Amino acid sequence: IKLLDEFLKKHDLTRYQLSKLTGISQNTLKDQNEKPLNKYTVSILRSLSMISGLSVSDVLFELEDIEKNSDDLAGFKHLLDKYKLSFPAQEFELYCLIKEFESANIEVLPFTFNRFENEEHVNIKKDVCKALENAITVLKEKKNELL
Amino acid sequence: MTIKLLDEFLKKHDLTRYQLSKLTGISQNTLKDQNEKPLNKYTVSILRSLSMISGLSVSDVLFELEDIEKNSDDLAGFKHLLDKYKLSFPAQEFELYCLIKEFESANIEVLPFTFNEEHVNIKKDVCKALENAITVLKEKKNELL
C-alpha cells in the first residue's frame, strides 16, 4: 500500500515536494516508501510534520492508522473484511499490541477461526466483537507474563 | 547538554536498561549505543518497546522523550537567557524547540539568536523575545513551503 505515499497523498503532498523541502534524496525517499512504520525515525516524523502542518504526534497517529488498515491484524483482517465489520477502538488496540510484540522480537502467531467460521452464529457482529476482545485479552496476558 | 534520553525516560518510570534488554532481547551494548543517540535517530520500534515496558501509549512516550530533550536543548540561545533570568515559558519554549527540530530534520541549520536596553518587566520582555524568535522561524519555514 506504501505507507509514506498514502500519508502524503492524504494531504495532497508528494515525495517530490518532501525531497525539495528537506534535501533528502529521491531514492532515499523511494526507499522510505517501502519501509514498515517500525523503521521510521523521529527525524522523518519531524520532516512530515514540517511539510504537512500536523504535530509530530498527529503525524505518527495518521501513519499508525494507515498501517493498521493494511495490517493482517494477526488474522482478524480476514474476519473483518469477510463479515464487513468495523470496531475502530478495538482494532487499533489489537494493532498496537501486535506492534509491541514485534518491537520486542516476539512472534505473534495468527489467530485462526475455522471452528468459528464453520458454526452458526446468533449475532455475527456481536460474536466477532467478542472474538476480538478475547484476542486483545490474550495478548495483554501474554505481555504481562513478560513484565 | 548531551543528556541520555533513554536513561532519563527509564529512570522516570523506575525502569532500567537491563530490564528493557530482558524484555526485548536487545543486547545491553546496543541499548548503550541507543542511550547516546539524539531523539531524531529514535525509531518507532524503540518507541513501541518503551510503550510496552512503561504502560504509556506510543504518543505519550514520544512526548516524554521530546520534553526531556527540549529541557536540555540550547534552544538557539534561549536556554542561556532563560537560565540567567530564571524564567519559564513551557508552551513557547516547546514551540521553538519543535521548529528547531523541524529545520534540523530538513538539514537546515538554525544559528543562535543573539542578545542592554532597560527592562521594567524582565518576565514580559524575555517572553516577547521568545515569541519574536518563534515568528522568525515560522516565517523562515513559510518561505520554504
PDB file of C-alpha atoms in Angstrom:
ATOM      1  CA  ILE A   1       0.000   0.000   0.000  1.00  0.00           C
ATOM      2  CA  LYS A   2       3.129   2.132   0.534  1.00  0.00           C
ATOM      3  CA  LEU A   3       2.805   3.982   3.795  1.00  0.00           C
ATOM      4  CA  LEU A   4       4.738   7.185   3.027  1.00  0.00           C
ATOM      5  CA  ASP A   5       2.869   7.829  -0.210  1.00  0.00           C
ATOM      6  CA  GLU A   6      -0.506   7.200   1.430  1.00  0.00           C
ATOM      7  CA  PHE A   7       0.213   9.786   4.127  1.00  0.00           C
ATOM      8  CA  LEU A   8       1.481  12.311   1.553  1.00  0.00           C
ATOM      9  CA  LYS A   9      -1.445  11.751  -0.772  1.00  0.00           C
ATOM     10  CA  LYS A  10      -3.908  12.180   2.104  1.00  0.00           C
ATOM     11  CA  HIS A  11      -2.526  15.709   2.468  1.00  0.00           C
ATOM     12  CA  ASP A  12      -2.169  16.413  -1.270  1.00  0.00           C
ATOM     13  CA  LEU A  13       1.634  16.208  -0.986  1.00  0.00           C
ATOM     14  CA  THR A  14       4.310  14.333  -2.952  1.00  0.00           C
ATOM     15  CA  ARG A  15       7.725  12.786  -2.288  1.00  0.00           C
ATOM     16  CA  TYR A  16       8.871  15.308  -4.867  1.00  0.00           C
ATOM     17  CA  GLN A  17       7.903  18.177  -2.522  1.00  0.00           C
ATOM     18  CA  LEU A  18       9.251  16.420   0.546  1.00  0.00           C
ATOM     19  CA  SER A  19      12.597  15.947  -1.166  1.00  0.00           C
ATOM     20  CA  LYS A  20      12.809  19.614  -2.171  1.00  0.00           C
ATOM     21  CA  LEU A  21      11.913  20.824   1.322  1.00  0.00           C
ATOM     22  CA  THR A  22      14.291  18.576   3.219  1.00  0.00           C
ATOM     23  CA  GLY A  23      17.198  17.895   0.878  1.00  0.00           C
ATOM     24  CA  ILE A  24      16.560  14.187   1.355  1.00  0.00           C
ATOM     25  CA  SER A  25      17.276  12.423  -1.937  1.00  0.00           C
ATOM     26  CA  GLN A  26      14.687  10.990  -4.349  1.00  0.00           C
ATOM     27  CA  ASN A  27      15.976   7.415  -3.988  1.00  0.00           C
ATOM     28  CA  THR A  28      16.190   7.670  -0.198  1.00  0.00           C
ATOM     29  CA  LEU A  29      12.508   8.588  -0.161  1.00  0.00           C
ATOM     30  CA  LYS A  30      11.615   5.804  -2.596  1.00  0.00           C
ATOM     31  CA  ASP A  31      13.324   3.503  -0.049  1.00  0.00           C
ATOM     32  CA  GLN A  32      11.422   5.168   2.813  1.00  0.00           C
ATOM     33  CA  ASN A  33       8.175   4.475   0.911  1.00  0.00           C
ATOM     34  CA  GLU A  34       8.807   0.726   1.233  1.00  0.00           C
ATOM     35  CA  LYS A  35       9.653   0.702   4.932  1.00  0.00           C
ATOM     36  CA  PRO A  36       7.270  -0.551   7.628  1.00  0.00           C
ATOM     37  CA  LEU A  37       6.379   2.055  10.271  1.00  0.00           C
ATOM     38  CA  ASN A  38       8.641   0.380  12.822  1.00  0.00           C
ATOM     39  CA  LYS A  39      11.660   1.615  10.812  1.00  0.00           C
ATOM     40  CA  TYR A  40      10.580   5.285  10.762  1.00  0.00           C
ATOM     41  CA  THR A  41      12.784   7.679  12.703  1.00  0.00           C
ATOM     42  CA  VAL A  42      11.642  10.703  14.675  1.00  0.00           C
ATOM     43  CA  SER A  43      13.615  12.700  12.072  1.00  0.00           C
ATOM     44  CA  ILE A  44      11.239  11.514   9.288  1.00  0.00           C
ATOM     45  CA  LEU A  45       8.237  12.209  11.518  1.00  0.00           C
ATOM     46  CA  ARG A  46       9.541  15.735  12.037  1.00  0.00           C
ATOM     47  CA  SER A  47      10.019  16.296   8.287  1.00  0.00           C
ATOM     48  CA  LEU A  48       6.460  15.150   7.609  1.00  0.00           C
ATOM     49  CA  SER A  49       5.240  17.366  10.463  1.00  0.00           C
ATOM     50  CA  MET A  50       7.011  20.325   8.872  1.00  0.00           C
ATOM     51  CA  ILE A  51       5.543  19.849   5.410  1.00  0.00           C
ATOM     52  CA  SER A  52       2.046  18.772   6.474  1.00  0.00           C
ATOM     53  CA  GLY A  53       1.360  21.166   9.346  1.00  0.00           C
ATOM     54  CA  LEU A  54       0.493  18.309  11.714  1.00  0.00           C
ATOM     55  CA  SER A  55       2.200  17.914  15.088  1.00  0.00           C
ATOM     56  CA  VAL A  56       4.769  15.114  15.243  1.00  0.00           C
ATOM     57  CA  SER A  57       2.253  13.290  17.464  1.00  0.00           C
ATOM     58  CA  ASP A  58      -0.540  13.623  14.895  1.00  0.00           C
ATOM     59  CA  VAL A  59       1.752  12.568  12.033  1.00  0.00           C
ATOM     60  CA  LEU A  60       2.614   9.352  13.936  1.00  0.00           C
ATOM     61  CA  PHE A  61      -1.063   8.677  14.649  1.00  0.00           C
ATOM     62  CA  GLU A  62      -2.088   9.072  10.987  1.00  0.00           C
ATOM     63  CA  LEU A  63       0.754   6.735   9.927  1.00  0.00           C
ATOM     64  CA  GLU A  64      -0.323   4.201  12.572  1.00  0.00           C
ATOM     65  CA  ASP A  65      -3.891   4.451  11.306  1.00  0.00           C
ATOM     66  CA  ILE A  66      -2.789   3.884   7.697  1.00  0.00           C
ATOM     67  CA  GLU A  67      -0.611   0.940   8.693  1.00  0.00           C
ATOM     68  CA  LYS A  68      -3.376  -0.519  10.884  1.00  0.00           C
ATOM     69  CA  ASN A  69      -5.789  -0.504   7.920  1.00  0.00           C
ATOM     70  CA  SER A  70      -3.474  -2.596   5.740  1.00  0.00           C
ATOM     71  CA  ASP A  71      -2.200  -4.857   8.525  1.00  0.00           C
ATOM     72  CA  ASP A  72      -3.201  -8.535   8.787  1.00  0.00           C
ATOM     73  CA  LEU A  73      -4.097  -7.886  12.453  1.00  0.00           C
ATOM     74  CA  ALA A  74      -2.943 -11.414  13.228  1.00  0.00           C
ATOM     75  CA  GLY A  75      -5.796 -12.931  11.231  1.00  0.00           C
ATOM     76  CA  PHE A  76      -8.597 -10.510  12.076  1.00  0.00           C
ATOM     77  CA  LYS A  77      -8.365  -8.587   8.808  1.00  0.00           C
ATOM     78  CA  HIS A  78      -9.856 -11.642   7.084  1.00  0.00           C
ATOM     79  CA  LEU A  79     -12.719 -11.844   9.591  1.00  0.00           C
ATOM     80  CA  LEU A  80     -13.433  -8.090   9.467  1.00  0.00           C
ATOM     81  CA  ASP A  81     -13.327  -7.909   5.668  1.00  0.00           C
ATOM     82  CA  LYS A  82     -15.403 -11.072   5.239  1.00  0.00           C
ATOM     83  CA  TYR A  83     -18.259 -10.061   7.506  1.00  0.00           C
ATOM     84  CA  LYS A  84     -17.920  -6.335   6.710  1.00  0.00           C
ATOM     85  CA  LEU A  85     -17.468  -5.214  10.312  1.00  0.00           C
ATOM     86  CA  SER A  86     -15.723  -2.243  11.903  1.00  0.00           C
ATOM     87  CA  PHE A  87     -14.628  -1.889  15.534  1.00  0.00           C
ATOM     88  CA  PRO A  88     -12.220   1.072  15.385  1.00  0.00           C
ATOM     89  CA  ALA A  89     -11.067   1.279  19.050  1.00  0.00           C
ATOM     90  CA  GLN A  90     -10.598  -2.486  19.451  1.00  0.00           C
ATOM     91  CA  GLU A  91      -8.873  -2.944  16.090  1.00  0.00           C
ATOM     92  CA  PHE A  92      -6.417  -0.206  16.975  1.00  0.00           C
ATOM     93  CA  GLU A  93      -5.752  -1.641  20.435  1.00  0.00           C
ATOM     94  CA  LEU A  94      -5.094  -5.067  18.843  1.00  0.00           C
ATOM     95  CA  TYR A  95      -2.809  -3.421  16.292  1.00  0.00           C
ATOM     96  CA  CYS A  96      -0.789  -1.611  18.984  1.00  0.00           C
ATOM     97  CA  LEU A  97      -0.291  -4.846  20.973  1.00  0.00           C
ATOM     98  CA  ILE A  98       0.831  -6.723  17.859  1.00  0.00           C
ATOM     99  CA  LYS A  99       3.346  -3.993  17.073  1.00  0.00           C
ATOM    100  CA  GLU A 100       4.637  -4.016  20.662  1.00  0.00           C
ATOM    101  CA  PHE A 101       5.435  -7.744  20.421  1.00  0.00           C
ATOM    102  CA  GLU A 102       7.087  -7.173  17.029  1.00  0.00           C
ATOM    103  CA  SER A 103       9.283  -4.465  18.520  1.00  0.00           C
ATOM    104  CA  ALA A 104      10.352  -6.973  21.206  1.00  0.00           C
ATOM    105  CA  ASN A 105      11.226  -9.600  18.577  1.00  0.00           C
ATOM    106  CA  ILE A 106       8.403 -11.837  19.760  1.00  0.00           C
ATOM    107  CA  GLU A 107       6.376 -13.749  17.216  1.00  0.00           C
ATOM    108  CA  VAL A 108       2.607 -13.344  17.307  1.00  0.00           C
ATOM    109  CA  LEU A 109       1.034 -16.445  15.794  1.00  0.00           C
ATOM    110  CA  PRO A 110      -2.101 -15.648  13.771  1.00  0.00           C
ATOM    111  CA  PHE A 111      -5.465 -16.056  15.445  1.00  0.00           C
ATOM    112  CA  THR A 112      -7.429 -18.619  13.425  1.00  0.00           C
ATOM    113  CA  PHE A 113     -11.168 -19.250  13.274  1.00  0.00           C
ATOM    114  CA  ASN A 114     -12.010 -22.397  11.450  1.00  0.00           C
ATOM    115  CA  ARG A 115     -14.448 -23.620  14.094  1.00  0.00           C
ATOM    116  CA  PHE A 116     -15.970 -20.102  14.348  1.00  0.00           C
ATOM    117  CA  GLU A 117     -16.447 -19.953  10.581  1.00  0.00           C
ATOM    118  CA  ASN A 118     -17.889 -23.447  10.426  1.00  0.00           C
ATOM    119  CA  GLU A 119     -20.549 -22.746  13.052  1.00  0.00           C
ATOM    120  CA  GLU A 120     -23.854 -20.892  13.194  1.00  0.00           C
ATOM    121  CA  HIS A 121     -23.972 -17.531  14.998  1.00  0.00           C
ATOM    122  CA  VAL A 122     -26.929 -15.784  16.711  1.00  0.00           C
ATOM    123  CA  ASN A 123     -25.354 -12.367  16.049  1.00  0.00           C
ATOM    124  CA  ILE A 124     -22.211 -12.306  13.896  1.00  0.00           C
ATOM    125  CA  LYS A 125     -21.269  -8.697  14.713  1.00  0.00           C
ATOM    126  CA  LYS A 126     -21.569  -9.421  18.427  1.00  0.00           C
ATOM    127  CA  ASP A 127     -19.637 -12.677  18.020  1.00  0.00           C
ATOM    128  CA  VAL A 128     -16.760 -11.141  16.096  1.00  0.00           C
ATOM    129  CA  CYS A 129     -16.605  -8.286  18.616  1.00  0.00           C
ATOM    130  CA  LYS A 130     -16.333 -10.860  21.390  1.00  0.00           C
ATOM    131  CA  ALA A 131     -13.616 -12.761  19.489  1.00  0.00           C
ATOM    132  CA  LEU A 132     -11.658  -9.531  19.038  1.00  0.00           C
ATOM    133  CA  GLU A 133     -11.983  -8.592  22.724  1.00  0.00           C
ATOM    134  CA  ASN A 134     -10.860 -12.124  23.640  1.00  0.00           C
ATOM    135  CA  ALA A 135      -7.776 -11.777  21.367  1.00  0.00           C
ATOM    136  CA  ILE A 136      -6.890  -8.434  22.965  1.00  0.00           C
ATOM    137  CA  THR A 137      -7.118 -10.082  26.388  1.00  0.00           C
ATOM    138  CA  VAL A 138      -4.817 -12.976  25.429  1.00  0.00           C
ATOM    139  CA  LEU A 139      -2.243 -10.568  24.048  1.00  0.00           C
ATOM    140  CA  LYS A 140      -2.401  -8.475  27.257  1.00  0.00           C
ATOM    141  CA  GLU A 141      -1.890 -11.628  29.338  1.00  0.00           C
ATOM    142  CA  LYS A 142       0.999 -12.692  27.101  1.00  0.00           C
ATOM    143  CA  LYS A 143       2.562  -9.247  27.584  1.00  0.00           C
ATOM    144  CA  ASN A 144       2.002  -9.409  31.343  1.00  0.00           C
ATOM    145  CA  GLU A 145       3.953 -12.684  31.612  1.00  0.00           C
ATOM    146  CA  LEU A 146       6.962 -10.788  30.238  1.00  0.00           C
ATOM    147  CA  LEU A 147       6.769  -7.841  32.666  1.00  0.00           C
TER     148      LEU A 147
ATOM    149  CA  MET B   1      23.907  19.493  27.213  1.00  0.00           C
ATOM    150  CA  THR B   2      24.008  15.927  25.908  1.00  0.00           C
ATOM    151  CA  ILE B   3      21.531  14.234  28.223  1.00  0.00           C
ATOM    152  CA  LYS B   4      20.997  10.476  27.969  1.00  0.00           C
ATOM    153  CA  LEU B   5      17.446  10.332  26.737  1.00  0.00           C
ATOM    154  CA  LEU B   6      16.864   6.634  27.152  1.00  0.00           C
ATOM    155  CA  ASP B   7      18.119   6.502  30.745  1.00  0.00           C
ATOM    156  CA  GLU B   8      16.161   9.621  31.704  1.00  0.00           C
ATOM    157  CA  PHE B   9      12.987   8.059  30.390  1.00  0.00           C
ATOM    158  CA  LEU B  10      13.572   4.716  32.083  1.00  0.00           C
ATOM    159  CA  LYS B  11      14.587   6.382  35.350  1.00  0.00           C
ATOM    160  CA  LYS B  12      11.318   8.338  35.443  1.00  0.00           C
ATOM    161  CA  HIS B  13       9.453   5.022  35.205  1.00  0.00           C
ATOM    162  CA  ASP B  14      11.595   3.136  37.720  1.00  0.00           C
ATOM    163  CA  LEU B  15      12.982   1.085  34.871  1.00  0.00           C
ATOM    164  CA  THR B  16      16.484   0.087  33.845  1.00  0.00           C
ATOM    165  CA  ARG B  17      18.213  -0.636  30.546  1.00  0.00           C
ATOM    166  CA  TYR B  18      18.794  -4.104  31.998  1.00  0.00           C
ATOM    167  CA  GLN B  19      15.027  -4.663  32.204  1.00  0.00           C
ATOM    168  CA  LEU B  20      14.461  -3.261  28.735  1.00  0.00           C
ATOM    169  CA  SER B  21      17.063  -5.696  27.409  1.00  0.00           C
ATOM    170  CA  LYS B  22      15.358  -8.624  29.191  1.00  0.00           C
ATOM    171  CA  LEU B  23      12.049  -7.722  27.572  1.00  0.00           C
ATOM    172  CA  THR B  24      13.190  -7.057  24.027  1.00  0.00           C
ATOM    173  CA  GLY B  25      16.204  -9.324  23.594  1.00  0.00           C
ATOM    174  CA  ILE B  26      18.126  -6.221  22.528  1.00  0.00           C
ATOM    175  CA  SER B  27      21.711  -6.570  23.819  1.00  0.00           C
ATOM    176  CA  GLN B  28      22.801  -4.219  26.586  1.00  0.00           C
ATOM    177  CA  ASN B  29      25.557  -2.757  24.407  1.00  0.00           C
ATOM    178  CA  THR B  30      23.009  -1.890  21.716  1.00  0.00           C
ATOM    179  CA  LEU B  31      20.995  -0.076  24.403  1.00  0.00           C
ATOM    180  CA  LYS B  32      24.184   1.706  25.474  1.00  0.00           C
ATOM    181  CA  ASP B  33      24.511   2.897  21.864  1.00  0.00           C
ATOM    182  CA  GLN B  34      20.822   3.853  21.919  1.00  0.00           C
ATOM    183  CA  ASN B  35      21.335   5.876  25.075  1.00  0.00           C
ATOM    184  CA  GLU B  36      23.897   8.047  23.192  1.00  0.00           C
ATOM    185  CA  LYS B  37      21.585   8.993  20.294  1.00  0.00           C
ATOM    186  CA  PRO B  38      19.629  12.235  19.870  1.00  0.00           C
ATOM    187  CA  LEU B  39      15.848  11.825  19.639  1.00  0.00           C
ATOM    188  CA  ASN B  40      15.838  12.312  15.847  1.00  0.00           C
ATOM    189  CA  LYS B  41      17.565   8.894  15.496  1.00  0.00           C
ATOM    190  CA  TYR B  42      14.918   7.049  17.554  1.00  0.00           C
ATOM    191  CA  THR B  43      12.787   4.596  15.584  1.00  0.00           C
ATOM    192  CA  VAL B  44       9.113   3.860  16.077  1.00  0.00           C
ATOM    193  CA  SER B  45      10.277   0.335  17.022  1.00  0.00           C
ATOM    194  CA  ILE B  46      12.116   1.766  20.035  1.00  0.00           C
ATOM    195  CA  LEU B  47       9.113   3.957  20.923  1.00  0.00           C
ATOM    196  CA  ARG B  48       6.921   0.827  20.876  1.00  0.00           C
ATOM    197  CA  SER B  49       9.330  -1.121  23.109  1.00  0.00           C
ATOM    198  CA  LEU B  50       9.299   1.770  25.614  1.00  0.00           C
ATOM    199  CA  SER B  51       5.488   1.894  25.388  1.00  0.00           C
ATOM    200  CA  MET B  52       5.371  -1.851  26.074  1.00  0.00           C
ATOM    201  CA  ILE B  53       7.545  -1.785  29.192  1.00  0.00           C
ATOM    202  CA  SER B  54       6.237   1.524  30.611  1.00  0.00           C
ATOM    203  CA  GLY B  55       2.487   1.185  30.077  1.00  0.00           C
ATOM    204  CA  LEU B  56       2.405   4.548  28.316  1.00  0.00           C
ATOM    205  CA  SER B  57       0.943   4.923  24.814  1.00  0.00           C
ATOM    206  CA  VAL B  58       3.449   5.393  21.971  1.00  0.00           C
ATOM    207  CA  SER B  59       2.290   9.014  21.725  1.00  0.00           C
ATOM    208  CA  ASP B  60       2.892   9.625  25.430  1.00  0.00           C
ATOM    209  CA  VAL B  61       6.351   8.023  25.217  1.00  0.00           C
ATOM    210  CA  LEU B  62       7.288  10.245  22.290  1.00  0.00           C
ATOM    211  CA  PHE B  63       6.111  13.350  24.086  1.00  0.00           C
ATOM    212  CA  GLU B  64       8.038  12.480  27.285  1.00  0.00           C
ATOM    213  CA  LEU B  65      11.215  11.976  25.233  1.00  0.00           C
ATOM    214  CA  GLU B  66      10.642  15.286  23.437  1.00  0.00           C
ATOM    215  CA  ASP B  67      10.098  17.077  26.725  1.00  0.00           C
ATOM    216  CA  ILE B  68      13.267  15.562  28.156  1.00  0.00           C
ATOM    217  CA  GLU B  69      15.175  16.569  25.042  1.00  0.00           C
ATOM    218  CA  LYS B  70      13.659  20.073  24.984  1.00  0.00           C
ATOM    219  CA  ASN B  71      14.578  20.770  28.586  1.00  0.00           C
ATOM    220  CA  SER B  72      18.248  20.216  27.810  1.00  0.00           C
ATOM    221  CA  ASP B  73      18.301  21.816  24.346  1.00  0.00           C
ATOM    222  CA  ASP B  74      20.202  25.068  23.762  1.00  0.00           C
ATOM    223  CA  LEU B  75      17.005  26.449  22.117  1.00  0.00           C
ATOM    224  CA  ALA B  76      19.076  28.518  19.675  1.00  0.00           C
ATOM    225  CA  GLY B  77      20.490  30.617  22.507  1.00  0.00           C
ATOM    226  CA  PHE B  78      17.359  30.959  24.627  1.00  0.00           C
ATOM    227  CA  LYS B  79      18.415  28.379  27.238  1.00  0.00           C
ATOM    228  CA  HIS B  80      21.239  30.620  28.477  1.00  0.00           C
ATOM    229  CA  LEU B  81      18.818  33.548  28.554  1.00  0.00           C
ATOM    230  CA  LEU B  82      16.039  31.630  30.301  1.00  0.00           C
ATOM    231  CA  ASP B  83      18.520  30.144  32.785  1.00  0.00           C
ATOM    232  CA  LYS B  84      20.148  33.511  33.519  1.00  0.00           C
ATOM    233  CA  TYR B  85      16.867  35.205  34.447  1.00  0.00           C
ATOM    234  CA  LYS B  86      15.242  32.068  35.934  1.00  0.00           C
ATOM    235  CA  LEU B  87      12.205  32.320  33.665  1.00  0.00           C
ATOM    236  CA  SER B  88       9.947  29.550  32.300  1.00  0.00           C
ATOM    237  CA  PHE B  89       7.524  29.640  29.331  1.00  0.00           C
ATOM    238  CA  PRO B  90       6.783  25.966  28.610  1.00  0.00           C
ATOM    239  CA  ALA B  91       4.475  26.297  25.543  1.00  0.00           C
ATOM    240  CA  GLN B  92       6.643  28.908  23.798  1.00  0.00           C
ATOM    241  CA  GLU B  93       9.882  27.062  24.595  1.00  0.00           C
ATOM    242  CA  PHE B  94       8.348  23.872  23.206  1.00  0.00           C
ATOM    243  CA  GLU B  95       7.119  25.587  20.038  1.00  0.00           C
ATOM    244  CA  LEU B  96      10.627  26.981  19.485  1.00  0.00           C
ATOM    245  CA  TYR B  97      12.080  23.541  20.199  1.00  0.00           C
ATOM    246  CA  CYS B  98       9.671  21.983  17.648  1.00  0.00           C
ATOM    247  CA  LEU B  99      10.640  24.444  14.882  1.00  0.00           C
ATOM    248  CA  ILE B 100      14.350  23.983  15.501  1.00  0.00           C
ATOM    249  CA  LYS B 101      13.969  20.211  15.243  1.00  0.00           C
ATOM    250  CA  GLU B 102      11.909  20.566  12.058  1.00  0.00           C
ATOM    251  CA  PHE B 103      14.702  22.567  10.439  1.00  0.00           C
ATOM    252  CA  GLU B 104      17.309  20.112  11.678  1.00  0.00           C
ATOM    253  CA  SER B 105      15.237  17.265  10.129  1.00  0.00           C
ATOM    254  CA  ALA B 106      15.361  19.247   6.872  1.00  0.00           C
ATOM    255  CA  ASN B 107      19.161  19.619   7.107  1.00  0.00           C
ATOM    256  CA  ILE B 108      18.830  23.345   7.755  1.00  0.00           C
ATOM    257  CA  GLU B 109      20.980  24.897  10.470  1.00  0.00           C
ATOM    258  CA  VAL B 110      19.404  27.309  12.938  1.00  0.00           C
ATOM    259  CA  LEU B 111      22.000  29.801  14.133  1.00  0.00           C
ATOM    260  CA  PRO B 112      21.658  31.051  17.735  1.00  0.00           C
ATOM    261  CA  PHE B 113      19.622  34.175  18.430  1.00  0.00           C
ATOM    262  CA  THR B 114      21.788  36.946  19.888  1.00  0.00           C
ATOM    263  CA  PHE B 115      21.005  39.113  22.913  1.00  0.00           C
ATOM    264  CA  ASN B 116      21.415  46.199  27.001  1.00  0.00           C
ATOM    265  CA  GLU B 117      18.141  48.126  26.936  1.00  0.00           C
ATOM    266  CA  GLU B 118      16.055  48.895  30.016  1.00  0.00           C
ATOM    267  CA  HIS B 119      13.636  46.331  31.388  1.00  0.00           C
ATOM    268  CA  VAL B 120      10.982  47.104  33.987  1.00  0.00           C
ATOM    269  CA  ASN B 121       9.338  43.712  33.412  1.00  0.00           C
ATOM    270  CA  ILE B 122      12.004  41.146  32.511  1.00  0.00           C
ATOM    271  CA  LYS B 123       9.454  38.289  32.571  1.00  0.00           C
ATOM    272  CA  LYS B 124       7.365  40.050  29.978  1.00  0.00           C
ATOM    273  CA  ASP B 125      10.262  41.201  27.792  1.00  0.00           C
ATOM    274  CA  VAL B 126      12.064  37.835  27.563  1.00  0.00           C
ATOM    275  CA  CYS B 127       8.652  36.314  26.782  1.00  0.00           C
ATOM    276  CA  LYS B 128       8.300  38.684  23.816  1.00  0.00           C
ATOM    277  CA  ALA B 129      11.887  37.991  22.748  1.00  0.00           C
ATOM    278  CA  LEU B 130      10.935  34.320  22.594  1.00  0.00           C
ATOM    279  CA  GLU B 131       7.656  34.984  20.772  1.00  0.00           C
ATOM    280  CA  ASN B 132       9.545  37.141  18.273  1.00  0.00           C
ATOM    281  CA  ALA B 133      12.070  34.349  17.633  1.00  0.00           C
ATOM    282  CA  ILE B 134       9.248  31.895  17.051  1.00  0.00           C
ATOM    283  CA  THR B 135       7.819  34.229  14.438  1.00  0.00           C
ATOM    284  CA  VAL B 136      11.207  34.461  12.709  1.00  0.00           C
ATOM    285  CA  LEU B 137      11.457  30.675  12.391  1.00  0.00           C
ATOM    286  CA  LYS B 138       7.805  30.419  11.267  1.00  0.00           C
ATOM    287  CA  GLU B 139       8.427  32.996   8.568  1.00  0.00           C
ATOM    288  CA  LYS B 140      11.617  31.165   7.557  1.00  0.00           C
ATOM    289  CA  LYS B 141       9.623  27.922   7.368  1.00  0.00           C
ATOM    290  CA  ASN B 142       6.752  29.521   5.465  1.00  0.00           C
ATOM    291  CA  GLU B 143       9.172  30.783   2.830  1.00  0.00           C
ATOM    292  CA  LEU B 144      10.093  27.143   2.200  1.00  0.00           C
ATOM    293  CA  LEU B 145       6.510  25.836   1.907  1.00  0.00           C
TER     294      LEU B 145
END
